[PDB]
Design a protein around this ligand. Structure first.
Ligand SMILES: Cc1cc2nc3c(=O)[nH]c(=O)nc-3n(C[C@H](O)[C@H](O)[C@H](O)COP(=O)(O)OP(=O)(O)OC[C@H]3O[C@@H](n4cnc5c(N)ncnc54)[C@H](O)[C@@H]3O)c2cc1C
Ligand SMILES: Cc1cc2nc3c(=O)[nH]c(=O)nc-3n(C[C@H](O)[C@H](O)[C@H](O)COP(=O)(O)OP(=O)(O)OC[C@H]3O[C@@H](n4cnc5c(N)ncnc54)[C@H](O)[C@@H]3O)c2cc1C
Ligand SMILES: Cc1cc2nc3c(=O)[nH]c(=O)nc-3n(C[C@H](O)[C@H](O)[C@H](O)COP(=O)(O)OP(=O)(O)OC[C@H]3O[C@@H](n4cnc5c(N)ncnc54)[C@H](O)[C@@H]3O)c2cc1C
Ligand SMILES: Cc1cc2nc3c(=O)[nH]c(=O)nc-3n(C[C@H](O)[C@H](O)[C@H](O)COP(=O)(O)OP(=O)(O)OC[C@H]3O[C@@H](n4cnc5c(N)ncnc54)[C@H](O)[C@@H]3O)c2cc1C
Ligand SMILES: OC[C@@H](O)[C@@H](O)CO
Lengths: 265, 274, 286, 286
């Protein structure tokens, strides 16, 4: 009864390109509900995001959702892009503002073009630029009311933060699924940098768990897998039936975590 | 409640750092490839400063370990092999080289309780004996096997080390029954980190160790997926020691099967680090 | 053992909050030389905690507005902190209010706590609008998790808070409460009403229960039975009252922090010890 | 809102405990005229709480046994309370111990806290047996939820407690702890070992953390990281330390009470304020 999705990013080197396709073959066997591919304005552009989406569709037949932002894009460009995507069978978009228009404006624009499945970003620990937690929650509701049919959370390591946030979403009348984004950690220095930039709290017990492992990739993997397996176990017990994995183009950890959730080939 | 409990459990584990004693069990290699692997694991695991390491039955490995690392290395000694006289000659030999700790077993005439008494009659060894939370296969009953452990301790055993187990409750209930029976030594959990479920299942079926339904299911479908087995097995073992540590267990014995990676990682989670 | 486990998790979560909590302190104008001395001692002590701002009350209908302004200037001069006067509209004409507001702004006072005040005309929302017309003030307004005593309904009072925010208020600060669930339920209702400002809990550390009970009864604030029982028999035991009160307040902020509250406003009544210690538990330290 | 609901229930349950909790207080022999004054002030204050008994320590190897006996007689004469001397066997022969015990009994002292004492022969269980041979004393003995530092194992230490109970001890009093789960787990293990006496938690209210940390480190008692963090930065702030410590102790006894504990032994270190207030929260009042 558990659905999963996997997020990938467009490879920038030949080596990473090989890694990604290996990972897609591995993870496709788990029949994810969808997969998605991120966008970076200065790290590959829309064309690379779209190329990987098309490649995934052709190779696997899976539903593949591009992350589409509105930064430095005009409404007419976004409409033209959306039409093209829809006509080419891309019918799920993760609608974002991007690292003028806010994301709710993009949701509205997209639904005007066609009846897209739309996913939007949610922040259990509050978007860094929000004027308040209340304002950020009202924004998520605006995005949902504009037509988003699921929210996907920023990653978190304090599970209670997700659970409390989900409760506040329900109280606010936000009736779509709030799907936890899960970041399996194999490189803690990299995770800490991402977390610091996004205001995501790293519990002291977790920082302690990675202490002394800067040069021990094997132990980091086993420790990180344990942390992620524990988290998904707790979340599932609390009624979560959908998980979105931030794979960073690697399959092994996400595949194993899915295994423990009973999501298997 | 589930979330808050895990946070508490994880933080409690974080704070035990520097208070857990561990030991590592190795076996004599049977090939050149396994020889290399063994000494690589010994070098990797020695950095953790185990209270002792042990070698199944051997004398050479024990000496090599002692000279190479200066760690207390306890040979396993059985009496299903030699005569009561030969043992005295074999035991007196160890004590005359620096071997002060011996794992006394009956072995896969006399029972282990007889070997403890004999060794004690030879010298003031540290003596570790085997315990069976799920009852030794030959024992007539749980109580008889329990009384036997008591005999072995009363004869001079100062540590008991358990057969591996996967049902934590079985261990905990057994530990309680031991104290109620007046056994005043710790019941040190033997931990078997599982990377090969087929192999672990074979071992368990030979030793009367139960494989829970949940565990069989966790390994279902992974016969050809070494990577996923390793992550799943590490998770299981890490969860086990986390629970055991909260229940006040501060000693763990690892059945490494001569491989360091899993036990090393599990130790790391217990705050046992270089 | 659920209760024990829950405590450890709550305590550890509190510990990891260090550096994330913003605090403010409310003072009142001293009426005696002794209270004047106490206040400045408290200001020195609490200023070391780097509060986001401090504020100074002004009693509606008192005619003692100059005392409030004098204390405000003294705080700014002495500490360099942002100091916000409370300003009430029930006892001044709009023209007088515009004059007072202009003088504040020209004196570098750019955060006002805008209130109606008790009836011995304008409502607080009218003052918010008047102030924003004068200059781009930071404006804080009163919120009532347990409903203002004069409100025709909880809905009317909630829509009034919305009115004040829509008029320009960029902070809401609550009346004190002892029923933590009441605050949390109110915070959720504020979202339901589309109010996008953070709802900052006002905390009253209790060292004198007789006094607190008088204030609570005047303001429609509920004192849970367990709290009444906790202070029973302590009329002549100031030491035990302080320890009991500190325990209550520390418990309250620990729970609020876990529920995501990262701003606290303390009703110090010009005393530093309790608020300082409560701040310490929140990781707000010199 | 689980956390808020859990607090209210725990607080209300504590309130309904009034009249059901038994308490005892431990004192030590004063070493200066100033401490002598403090002790008698504390005895007067705490005696009003009607403790089941009080006790007075005796430092093993100190040679100052007469000071303990003198304080005990003074307490009985002044308050009429049951007062129990601590008696150690490490530093006296069995004959001396029988003499001391007989003199106690003939002096109306019929509860002894029977201890081994630190090594500068007999174990505490030997003293229990010796005392019971002299007369039908009430005998209290030490228990260690976190295991006595010298024990060969947790099992050995637990069986030792059983030995002391089987020898005649009718109370067990624990070393202090700050990890509440450790006490609760130990209480369960005591049942598993067939020990039928109540395991009374010894509570150390902390006002001086440096001192407490020294004691804890000597006795193998764990200080949770959140507690270390709570006292960080308070070396020169006695006021905040007291409020923080009171909060910790009050939280601890609230949890213990909910788990069915109805007996508490306070390590007062001769000071009354904290223990008195903690007792107040348990409904133990004059
Ligand atoms: C699951 C997930 C996938 C992501 N994928 C990508 C990706 O592929 N590429 C990329 O560049 N970034 C990506 N991001 C990050 C995202 O782009 C940033 O977090 C960005 O800063 C906000 O995007 P958003 O869609 O959340 O914007 P919004 O929902 O519009 O919110 C952004 C901020 O604006 C505030 N806000 C909303 N409306 C108003 C208003 N009317 N007035 C004032 N403030 C307002 C919000 O409260 C918030 O603080 C992703 C984030 C998540 C959670
Ligand atoms: C940590 C550990 C390390 C081990 N290392 C080795 C090794 O290096 N080499 C090896 O060959 N094997 C090893 N073994 C396995 C062990 O040798 C076998 O399990 C053997 O079957 C029993 O050995 P034991 O020392 O338990 O014998 P025992 O303690 O003597 O008990 C064995 C059986 O005899 C029964 N029994 C004992 N005394 C009596 C009596 N007086 N009357 C009736 N029944 C009695 C007991 O209940 C039990 O069923 C190890 C086992 C463990 C748990
Ligand atoms: C943090 C804080 C600081 C304070 N500082 C002071 C101070 O320094 N000096 C002082 O004298 N008092 C102070 N007060 C108290 C305050 O002044 C009283 O509570 C007063 O009764 C209402 O003030 P208000 O700003 O909330 O008024 P309002 O927001 O105007 O509300 C007052 C009542 O009017 C009702 N109401 C609002 N608009 C209408 C309308 N159009 N028609 C009919 N009813 C309406 C509201 O529902 C409410 O019942 C403070 C209160 C708080 C919470
Ligand atoms: C409530 C309380 C009050 C106290 N009051 C005092 C005081 O007033 N004066 C003072 O000097 N100290 C006092 N102590 C401390 C005490 O004396 C020390 O902790 C001392 O080290 C042990 O005392 P015990 O009575 O617990 O000894 P025991 O119960 O005899 O135990 C001491 C150690 O010996 C081990 N042991 C017991 N029997 C044997 C055996 N047959 N063979 C090998 N090991 C054995 C036990 O496991 C334990 O490790 C007190 C402790 C508590 C908890
Ligand atoms: O939402 C943030 C997510 O895209 C990062 O974890 C990328 O890895």
């Amino acid at each position: 009864q558990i659905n999963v999705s996997f997020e990938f990013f467009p490879p920038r080197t030949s080596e990473m390109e090989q890694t990604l396709w290996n990972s897609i073959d591995r993870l496709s066997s788990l029949k994810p509900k969808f997969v998605s591919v991120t966008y970076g304005a200065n790290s590959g552009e829309r064309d690379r995001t779209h190329s990987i989406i098309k490649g995934i569709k052709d190779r696997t037949g899976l539903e593949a959702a591009p992350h589409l932002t509105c930064i430095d894009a005009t409404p007419d460009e976004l409409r033209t892009i959306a039409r093209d995507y829809w006509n080419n069978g891309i019918r799920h978009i993760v609608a974002l503002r991007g690292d003028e228009m806010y994301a709710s404006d993009l949701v509205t624009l997209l639904k005007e073009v066609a009846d897209f499945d739309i996913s939007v970003a949610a922040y259990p620990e509050v978007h860094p630029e929000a004027k308040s937690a209340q304002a950020d929650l009202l924004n998520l509701k605006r995005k949902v009311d504009a037509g988003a049919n699921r929210a996907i959370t920023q990653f978190f390591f304090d599970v209670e933060s997700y659970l409390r946030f989900r409760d506040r979403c329900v109280s606010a009348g936000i009736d779509v699924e709030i799907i936890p984004g899960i970041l399996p950690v194999s490189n803690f220095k990299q995770a800490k940098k991402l977390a610091d930039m996004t205001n995501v709290r790293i519990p002291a017990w977790m920082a302690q768990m990675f202490d002394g492992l800067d040069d021990d990739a094997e132990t980091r993997k086993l420790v990180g897998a344990n942390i992620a397996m524990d988290m998904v176990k707790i979340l599932s017990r609390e009624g979560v039936k959908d998980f979105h994995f931030y794979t960073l183009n690697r399959a092994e950890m996400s595949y194993a975590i899915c295994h423990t959730l009973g999501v298997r080939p």
